[PDB]
């Protein structure tokens, strides 16, 4: 499906947001908000600040 990789190390400052390491890439990352994303990091889903993350193509 979809995928993404964190540009830097970020801390999800949200109730429905998860954190992940830069090199730590995740899968199943869809784009709901033009500024925010959502994907599965190590099994669990969450939200990603597009600012510290980038999908893959």
């Amino acid at each position: 499906g979809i995928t993404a990789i964190a540009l830097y190390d970020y801390q999800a400052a949200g109730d429905d947001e998860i954190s992940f390491d830069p090199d730590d890439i995740i899968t199943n990352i869809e784009m709901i908000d033009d500024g925010w994303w959502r994907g599965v990091c190590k099994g669990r889903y969450g939200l990603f600040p597009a600012n510290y993350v980038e999908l893959r193509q």
Partner: peptide, 19 residues
């Protein structure tokens, strides 16, 4: 070898109320 500073935070996403 890449160097980049952290970007600003985006506005919280919109979410409708629960059913």
């Amino acid at each position: 070898t890449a160097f980049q500073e952290p970007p600003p935070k985006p506005s919280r996403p919109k979410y409708r109320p629960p059913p």
